[PDB]
Amino acid sequence: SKTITIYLDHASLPTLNQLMHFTKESEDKETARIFGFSRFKLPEKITEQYNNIHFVEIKNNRPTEDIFTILDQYPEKLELDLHLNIAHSIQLFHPILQYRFKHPDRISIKSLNLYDDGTAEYVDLEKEENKDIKSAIKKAEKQLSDYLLTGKINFDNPTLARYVWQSQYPVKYHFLSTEYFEKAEFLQPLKTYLAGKYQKMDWSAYEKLSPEQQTFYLKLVGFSDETKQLFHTEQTKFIFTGTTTWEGNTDIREYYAKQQLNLLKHFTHSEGDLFIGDQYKIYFKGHPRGGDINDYILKHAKDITNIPANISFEILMMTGLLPDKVGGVASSLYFSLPKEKISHIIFTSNKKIKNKEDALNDPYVRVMLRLGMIDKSQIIFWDSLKQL
């Protein structure tokens, strides 16, 4: 037997957890790894330490058949440790199933770790509130068993099908919101079914890591020392969440920049409606596609620390660098935040949201309200705020 650890994600959150797993297994330079990522590519100083390290292209929603060529290199009996994105598991998994069929005697799936894409999974669960969950589970267990025998992808409820891997394999689930599964009454049959097999995405894993392993982790994910230091201070920290443009009545990027400069001031200036107070050090986390908009805000905002595009909120979480407060333009990252860390979330107009009432109906917003991660006073439509 040779164990092969296989990491697959096209999004970014799973990738970041999967790399944390790799960091913990980091001493082991022997076991073969296949890295099937869309975003992250790994430093040569790290990869060249590992003598059985392979990389596979993720085209569409799945690994390419390059993965067949990679596994052809290992003619031993093989046991695969799969790590997968929860929402896209079936699609990510299928090429591995195909390959197993070609070598049915010689290759097996030792285990699965499954990780939340993001808010997608929850938005999706929310669409199933009216179903018979207890019966849907038994159905999927059966359909999954057919699927592994045949290769035929046929599930009556694809969404719930994501959570029934334990009928086939040793499995472990990593959730953004363990509270959702606990408080959603309709899901109690699923909660009960998954007991023992899930845990909350760990922001503390990083502090547990030995100094050596942490440095290992920051290298993997792109976190420079220079930018790591920006968070060294013991001063409490507020982060403004930037955006690009929205359905203002104009194409002029500099309009949207100025407006956000206004929104920022509502947080930072004592005259602001949303004044957070003088305790916080102010950071800017601009959209990666921000460009000249981000240039503009950094130019006109005083006393503000910029955070580079490469440093997502997800990385901050995974390194225990969540700040004491977050506020600004509405995005689904807020789903991931603890309730104590959310000042105000501001919705800009697009085609679904034209007003606060619409904002209150955005799928991820509604669940956050039910879980009480925010109150309606924290939802603000951008139009309602004056000019300073």
What is 251-317 written as a DSSP string? Answer: --HHHHHHHHHHHHHHHHSTTSTT---TTSEEEEE--TT-THHHHHHHHH-SS-EE--TTS-HHHHH
Instruction: Please give the torsion angle defined by the CA atoms of residues 246, 250, 253 and 254, in that order, rounded to the nearest 10 degrees.
Output: -120
Q: Are residues 267 and 216 in the same domain?
A: yes
Q: Are residues 216 and 182 in the same domain?
A: no
Please choose, from the candidates 167, 191, 56, 163, the residue with its C-alpha nearest in 3D space to the C-alpha of residue 109.
167
CA distances from 41 to 32, 88, 130, 220 (A): 17, 20, 42, 8
Task: Record the tokens describing residue 361, joined without a space.
Answer: 């109906």
Distance separating alpha carbons of residues 34 and 8, to the nearest angstrom: 8
Strands 58-59 and 62-63 turn out to be antiparallel
Q: Are residues 322 and 284 in the same domain?
A: yes
Distance separating alpha carbons of residues 32 and 51, to the nearest angstrom: 8
3-state helix, strand, coil in the chain (%, to 5): 40, 20, 40
For residue 262, give the CATH number of its domain.
3.40.50.11110
Q: Are residues 69 and 189 in the same domain?
A: yes
* Contact in structure between 347 and 381 (CB atoms under 8 Å): yes
Q: Are residues 94 and 164 in the same domain?
A: yes
Distance separating alpha carbons of residues 262 and 354, to the nearest angstrom: 19
- Total count of domains within the chain: 2
Q: Are residues 197 and 233 in the same domain?
A: no
* Contact in structure between 213 and 24 (CB atoms under 8 Å): yes
Indicate the residue among 193, 209, 225 that finishes a domain. 209
Q: Three-state SS for 341?
A: helix
The reported resolution of this PDB entry, expressed in Å, is 2.6
Q: Are residues 309 and 342 in the same domain?
A: yes
Q: Three-state SS for 382?
A: helix
State which H helix or E strand residue 350 sits in. none
For residue 163, give the CATH number of its domain.
3.40.50.11120
Amino acid identity, position 370: R
State which H helix or E strand residue 34 sits in. strand 32-37
Q: Three-state SS for 105?
A: coil
Q: Three-state SS for 360?
A: helix
Q: Residue 270's domain spans which residues?
A: 210-385
Amino acid identity, position 163: Y
Q: Are residues 296 and 360 in the same domain?
A: yes
Task: Record the tokens describing residue 234, joined without a space.
Answer: 């013991």
Q: Are residues 221 and 331 in the same domain?
A: yes
* 120 CB burial (10 A radius; 0-12, 13-18, 19+): middle
Distance separating alpha carbons of residues 67 and 92, to the nearest angstrom: 12
Indicate the residue among 209, 228, 253 that finishes a domain. 209
State which H helix or E strand residue 74 sits in. none
R_g of the chain computed on alpha carbons: 23
Q: Are residues 43 and 109 in the same domain?
A: yes
* Contact in structure between 154 and 147 (CB atoms under 8 Å): yes
Indicate the residue among 177, 194, 209 that finishes a domain. 209
Q: Are residues 283 and 157 in the same domain?
A: no
| DSSP codes of every residue in 141-167 | HHHHHHHHHH-----SSHHHHTT-GGG
Please choose, from the candidates 57, 178, 175, 38, the residue with its C-alpha nearest in 3D space to the C-alpha of residue 113.
175
Q: Are residues 84 and 195 in the same domain?
A: yes
